[PDB]
Amino acid sequence: RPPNIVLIFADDLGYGDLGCYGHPSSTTPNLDQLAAGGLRFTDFYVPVSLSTPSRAALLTGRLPVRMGMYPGVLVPSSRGGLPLEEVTVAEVLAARGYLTGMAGKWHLGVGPEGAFLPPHQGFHRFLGIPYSHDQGPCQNLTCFPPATPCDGGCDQGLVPIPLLANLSVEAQPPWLPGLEARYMAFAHDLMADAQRQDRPFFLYYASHHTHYPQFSGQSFAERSGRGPFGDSLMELDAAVGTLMTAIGDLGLLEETLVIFTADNGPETMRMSRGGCSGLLRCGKGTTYEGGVREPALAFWPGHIAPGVTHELASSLDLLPTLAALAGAPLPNVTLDGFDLSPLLLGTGKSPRQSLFFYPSYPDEVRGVFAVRTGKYKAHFFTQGSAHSDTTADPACHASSSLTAHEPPLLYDLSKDPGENYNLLGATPEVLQALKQLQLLKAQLDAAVTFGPSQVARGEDPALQICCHPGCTPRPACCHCP
Template sequence: MKNKLILSVLSGCAFIPVQAQVHTNFIVINLDDVGYGDFSYKGALGYRTPNIDKMAAEGMQFTHFLAAQPVSGASRAALLTGCYPNRIGFSGAPGPDSKTGIDAGEETIAEVLKKKNYATAVYGKWHLGHLEPFLPLQNGFDEYYGLPYSNDMWPYHPQNGIWFNFPDLPTIENNKIIGYNTDQSKFTTDYTDRTINFIRKNKDVPFFIYLAHSMPHVPLAVSGKFKGKSEQGLYGDVMMELDWSVGQVLQTLKDLNLEENTLVILTSDNGPWINYGNHAGSTGGLREAKGTTFEGGNRVPFIAYWKGKIEAGTVCNRMASNIDILPTLADISNAPLSQNKIDGVSLLPLMKGDMEMIPHQYFFYYYRVNDLEAVTDGTYKLIFPHKHRTYSLFPPGNDGKPGEVKEDFELKEPQLYDLRRDAGESYNIINEYPEIADRLEKAAMTTREDIGDNLTNMKGANRRPIGRVNK
């Protein structure tokens, strides 16, 4: 009688099926020192990158994507917080003697996504502070394995004892040092295997993986799977192995039927370190390279792959930056942003095909501690007088040895370039277009008042302090 009563009650109600919650997973692959011309679809010679080429062919590639600073630590701080790094007091590439790192008051991508119950992991290079308060597990990540800073900050640096005195390089798992001076030829495989295992373990819940490869930053190292496989020597071997890694990740998503609810992003922290010659990548013809705010230092590859959501083979020419990654993932996941001011904007409209969207009216090229060295509207770029690194005065080194660079080459007069016609920044047109230079100067003054500028002795009203420990 009881069962009949239940059936009778149910028969009078409309049946509403309960749908499983749909979520989007995120994988951000951040390569180290990869140049604008380093993939075969971009013209690289002597090796192929078929998996990355496939990502570009089946996803969206951005042609004008800028790292917030042309140096590793600051660029990574920008990617993970959505801020110009100098807004949060971050600059340069902190090393083993640093007492600073990302402040506890800042929110990383992992912390933002934790609000939506994401499982989070980072495998690879961290570089936001190596002391325990600054490590990933204290910044929203569930798992961490990798190097706390650059892989050349170790006793085997070719200039150790001359310019540097680096101690042993730790490998860290979660918060624990598990070894020193680890054979670097294993890292690309290790990072990849851990990424795949994390995907399999969390295939039924939302996840975010930050896969921050140590390569192809010098010293180059490659596993036996790819050693000697390219026509370009060790650099080509390393690029082939990184492409293999991307392929393994994409195949895992396909095997687990996760392609349609996983956004995969591929980019680089800054341009190539070209004074390392045959152990360095290609800027694709852009001026200068890593450590400079010319286009070769800031402009990097960016591919977004999201099967069924991003139209295959799309090319986006809008100016965007790695400060936009955090707000994009927050937008897609409907996760609330930090109460702190950030500088990035969501690129989701562009990914959906709204090519009329303009993410940024201006982009500001900061470097060193807080020097505003240039500003662009995406077409014209105004460069202010400043001292900068130049590679062009000296031949590069080879086989792991760096060539000379001049660190304080002085640019004495402002310069204006039309990046549409002159992405190599060769022809100064400031005398022909003074009104454009004036407009860009006014935009620069606004951000000087906001974030500051050491070159003009302006402190900025809205800078926040970097994290610091007294040890």
């Protein structure tokens, strides 16, 4: 009865990057076709605009400060990880009998002997890389076949990036032009195996696209007409069409819920090799709309009718929605999202009225940076980020430092989604939205206690995954392509 679930989570992809969100040159025909037969969200969000914290919020339905996923993101030598006590979506569904699987980027911790890898947090199967694909040296990797090198090098002084199969190293580094096919094959098998055992599957496809450095297999190389970023986006888009073909082929169309979104806004610092936030301001790394507002599609033929909703939703709402849809019961913890099944099925409205945004480097004295209620968004603190540099708007740059705003900066996102015209720069509607925004910030800051930081537990180079355990010299002896 419970539907099969496929959750596709792109990386560093902006609001204005899909064809259906208005980009003029992107090539994304399969995602356009899922939008044309599904529910396209104009106002969907992540609460924090960096990789680790966004991934924590999606899998647990909880604000990332609650379990210590701040500040910044995890690195290969990190001791910390998403605590084992947190209950992930995969745990929830596994318990109700789903065959659960994951392909792609994890970025929730590796840890002493791989204690924080996906196999320990509810996934029966896992093929992927434990953190971003640029967190290891890439000056010798090929990003586009036959022999176009990845640009710029990536992180230095580290072990090459490992492709893992559950807890084992399958390759190190892997061959980037072929990851996609490896991942389509793993997905195909998980589906067919679940069909064979009469059980609902759960696939978590965390693509590496469209994070730096860009890479694609040879059928996309130089075919998109938007350069490397396009080629990579187009391969993501062809992976989606492949999952949808597999779904067809097994007669699972009307029995599978498919959701597509992305962790955080675009890295405009990669300039024309990075994404596009469309009309929204800034990108990755900030609490402006361009870093937290993501594309989001939901497609379940015969259940979700084609259309466009403007209602509020968050990545935080998808554990509780998915639990509801599968008759699985919610963990016994404070959850920050809601069930959106009425909205999806067309019998209700979203229960969500407010959204709370924390910065990359949060703290307990300052609290949440921005809050949206209804159509109004208030910024109490503002800040630019090096991930959002190089555009003409100077509020996005790393040189725009932390600035308190009292009274906050106040925007009407229905008329001014671009965040240009501060409404307090008076009216009764406004003054009443101002008092509610202030009360919601003070209530949340008074009730949330931050979990102790996982990222500040430091680093240990000995925690790095090595294909040839005990070899020497570390890290470059660690490799087995």
